[PDB]
Enzyme design. Structure first.
Site, PDB file in Angstrom:
ATOM      1  N   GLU B 209       0.883  -1.163   0.000  1.00  0.00           N
ATOM      2  CA  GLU B 209       0.000   0.000   0.000  1.00  0.00           C
ATOM      3  C   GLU B 209       0.920   1.213   0.000  1.00  0.00           C
ATOM      4  OE1 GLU B 209      -3.432   0.217   0.111  1.00  0.00           O
ATOM      5  OE2 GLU B 209      -3.965  -1.917   0.244  1.00  0.00           O
ATOM      6  N   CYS B 243      -2.685   9.233   2.816  1.00  0.00           N
ATOM      7  CA  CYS B 243      -2.284   8.497   1.614  1.00  0.00           C
ATOM      8  C   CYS B 243      -3.196   8.795   0.435  1.00  0.00           C
ATOM      9  CB  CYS B 243      -2.305   6.997   1.899  1.00  0.00           C
ATOM     10  SG  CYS B 243      -3.964   6.429   2.376  1.00  0.00           S
TER      11      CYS B 243
HETATM   12  C1  LIG Z   1     -11.346   2.573   6.994  1.00  0.00           C
HETATM   13  C2  LIG Z   1     -10.693   3.619   6.148  1.00  0.00           C
HETATM   14  C3  LIG Z   1      -9.182   3.451   6.067  1.00  0.00           C
HETATM   15  C4  LIG Z   1      -8.476   3.874   7.339  1.00  0.00           C
HETATM   16  C5  LIG Z   1      -8.287   5.379   7.459  1.00  0.00           C
HETATM   17  C6  LIG Z   1      -6.890   5.833   7.076  1.00  0.00           C
HETATM   18  C7  LIG Z   1      -6.404   5.251   5.760  1.00  0.00           C
HETATM   19  C8  LIG Z   1      -5.036   5.726   5.421  1.00  0.00           C
HETATM   20  O1  LIG Z   1      -4.642   6.848   5.519  1.00  0.00           O
END
Ligand SMILES: CCCCCCCC=O
Ligand SMILES: CCCCCCCC=O
Ligand SMILES: [K+]
Ligand SMILES: [K+]
Ligand SMILES: [K+]
Ligand SMILES: [K+]
EC number: 1.2.1.5
Lengths: 448, 447
Positions: B209, B243
């Site tokens: 990721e 991200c």
């Molecule tokens: C459940 C949604 C993903 C988690 C939140 C942060 C994702 C990465 O920055």
């Protein structure tokens, strides 16, 4: 260089958009159907020269599965390629949620030598269906098929999008410096690590179809006659040179002798008393592999066969009994017509035996006890599993084919081919209008 | 070594079969629920200390998604774990054909620092549900959350199966010599190649990721008041350290000043005149990243913000106009509260701009023209897409979350997490009954 120019032309042709309409992809797939029909005698002759195949097992043990794949993916391509709505939630009920499928770009397929038509073209079929450019690298060990594919593929398929790369290991190494969007490799566990290392330089995803020793457990209480006929069939097709051949047998020592006798009987039915005179029996691919496999009989208890003709790369169907698991024939993937029998005293011993070794590409068991079946599956791990037959579980459109651990990662065949060679892109499409219910997410946060 | 022994113990625990019963996995997931409930203040305090979060966005922007994943997976685990029958053929009617799901073994989760609870524990939740041992490597940059997890995870979870590995780069490099059955890594594109290279040594499959610059195309004729409030929210949450933040804007020159004014309006509503005094505005994670992001402001035309405080790592919400795509702020993932605007003269030019760059983790577009939306999706490639919103598409159980190309490979969330952390094993079970319809396959072959 020639390799670099081929990839440059394939990427330029992909970037032009030519592969995106389904109409174009189906045409290329129909061209491959035409290739198989028009080049039948050429394909049979190449497999005969490489592997001592004949027209019957060239088709029913290799080529037919490519045609089946093509026909299936052509009929299903519009459904698979469609945007796919997914489940919503109360908060997303007015939105569109769906999975969008799109090509990865330029895909590399590295074939192997033991089924040099299927294991080069059936993966390509999938990558074509998914809208990619597909570069092919045939194995040099099956020289005649490699030469044939280099000639006839450009006579049927788009010349820029689907090039064939000639050569051996030096050329593959230079090819692997090029940037691909996916690599599917079939072959050995060791080289799999080399492929994955080269892919890492470009963050290229890989499908690795690799190796191992596919165990074959035989239950004391099963129909040894039908079990042994099927084992012989899968072990000795292609002169044992099959990725999911039942590599060795685990059995109670109390039935080792009956297994040896019923294997012998089936083998005599298949290939006659002298397999060297049977049109249906193959030959080892090369002098190196002939020497390697013969080396695995040295020092062993030969119950049957055990001889080989270096000049014609013929190794007679061989059975070994009371095999030391630590001996050479039990320490490498055999890929030859030498079938060792390893004695275990219980199912639980066999499970432990399998689990102590690397995870195999296929696991087989012969038994009419469902408790035995479910338990061996539940307590082991393998690429795929077949109960009471061999080979066939990798020929079904609904059963993705691939390994785990040292036997590989990823899978293909049928719908899984389309997925493996696509990016599946999650999409959320909202109306652009004031939504009072969204305002809770904006700062300022509630101070209490 | 400590690390060797930890992974040794984890694989021994896994090999004993302890994780295979579903009730054991659910017990571990319930323990994580109890961890989150009982350690709420501690988790908030660590997120405040690492990233200047508060009680509210610690939960609603990070922790709540982990709870949602846990409850969902508990509910669905028996169905997901069931053998799955698949389609037969005329020749296989008497046979069983099905997919058998089984754990891969010992899974490694390498977390990152910007959502240091979610991006360590939400992947873990999926790997636990799939029946694997899960080794955790928190990011050292979020020091307080790393130390907290090292303390509380073994207080709630099985201590052999779910170890927390302490340390930074050296310890991660050491850890990566160990043999795992899957590695999920969230972080930078460059380090992803290092992960994959280490994984190749053991033929370890990877879920990577990674990063990139997620474009945000704004259509000339859409409702800019709505669009810019949503863009501002996603860009400046977590002080831009997300991200899938809308990294930069592409827009027609004719709406550039309207975009600036409406972004400013939303930013003052969110954070006030001086965002440094807002409880809701974050801080940069480290001195190095602070200096990196400030450097990207140098030489640019600042329409809003543009100042920082090095000592506390505050960067004011910043908007840059008429940005040169060749300049530093448009040559790296910003991961900070600096929003450049790049002018383009048509949708076609925007598409070409996006395609000439590496594939982004997210692609965003704002437009009330469905044909615009469908065309941009059709002709680009990105990990995921949101049209007329940002961020939210990675929060839905039904939309697998992952990249493509330089933004990564593989995906997780919801059912996809269970699949990603399992081996899906094709199974064929036939009767050991003589079959005359099979005998045609045996030699001798016909003439
Ligand atoms: C459940 C949604 C993903 C988690 C939140 C942060 C994702 C990465 O920055
Ligand atoms: C049914 C398609 C595959 C069969 C051809 C041989 C597979 C060997 O790896
Ligand atoms: K579909
Ligand atoms: K609000
Ligand atoms: K400028
Ligand atoms: K026959």
């Amino acid at each position: 260089s020639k390799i670099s120019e081929a990839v440059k032309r394939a990427r330029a042709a992909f970037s032009s958009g030519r592969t995106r309409p389904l109409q174009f992809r189906i045409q290329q797939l129909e061209a491959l159907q035409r290739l198989i029909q028009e080049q039948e005698q050429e394909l049979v002759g190449a497999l005969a020269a490489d592997l001592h195949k004949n027209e019957w097992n060239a088709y029913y043990e290799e080529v037919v599965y490519v045609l089946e794949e093509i026909e299936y993916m052509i009929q299903k391509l519009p459904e698979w390629a469609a945007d796919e709505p997914v489940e919503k939630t109360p908060q997303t009920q007015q939105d569109e949620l769906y999975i969008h499928s799109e090509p990865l770009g330029v895909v590399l397929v590295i074939g192997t030598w033991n089924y040099p038509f299927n294991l080069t073209i059936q993966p390509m079929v999938g990558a074509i269906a998914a809208g990619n450019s597909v570069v092919l690298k045939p194995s040099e060990l099956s020289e005649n098929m490699a030469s044939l594919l280099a000639t006839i593929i450009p006579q049927y398929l788009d010349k820029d999008l689907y090039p064939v790369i000639n050569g051996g290991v030096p050329e593959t190494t230079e090819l692997l410096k090029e940037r691909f969007d996916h690599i599917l490799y079939t072959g050995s566990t060791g080289v799999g690590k080399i492929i994955m290392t080269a892919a890492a330089k470009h963050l290229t995803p890989v499908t690795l179809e690799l190796g191992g020793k596919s165990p074959c457990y035989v239950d004391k209480n099963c129909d040894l006659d039908v079990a042994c006929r099927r084992i012989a069939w899968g072990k000795f097709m292609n002169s044992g040179q099959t990725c999911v051949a039942p590599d060795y047998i685990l059995c109670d020592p109390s039935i080792q002798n009956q297994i040896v006798e019923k294997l012998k009987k089936s083998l005599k039915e298949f290939y006659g008393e002298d397999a060297k005179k049977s049109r249906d029996y193959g030959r080892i691919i090369s002098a190196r592999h002939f020497q390697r496999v013969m080396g695995l009989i040295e020092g062993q208890k030969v119950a049957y066969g055990g001889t080989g003709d270096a000049a014609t790369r013929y190794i007679a169907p061989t059975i070994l009994t009371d095999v030391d698991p630590q001996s050479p024939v039990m320490q490498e993937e055999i890929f030859g017509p030498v079938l060792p029998i390893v004695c275990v005293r219980s199912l639980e011993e066999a499970i432990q035996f399998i689990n102590q070794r690397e995870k195999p590409l296929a696991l087989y068991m012969f038994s009419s006890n469902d408790k035995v079946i479910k338990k061996m599956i539940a307590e082991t791990s393998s690429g795929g599993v077949a109960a009471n037959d061999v080979i066939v579980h990798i020929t079904l459109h609904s059963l993705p084919f691939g390994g785990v651990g040292n036997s590989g990662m990823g899978s293909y065949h049928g719908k899984k081919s389309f997925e493996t060679f696509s990016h599946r892109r999650s999409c959320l499409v909202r109306p652009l209008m004031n939504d009072e219910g969204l305002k809770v997410r904006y700062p300022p946060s509630p101070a209490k």
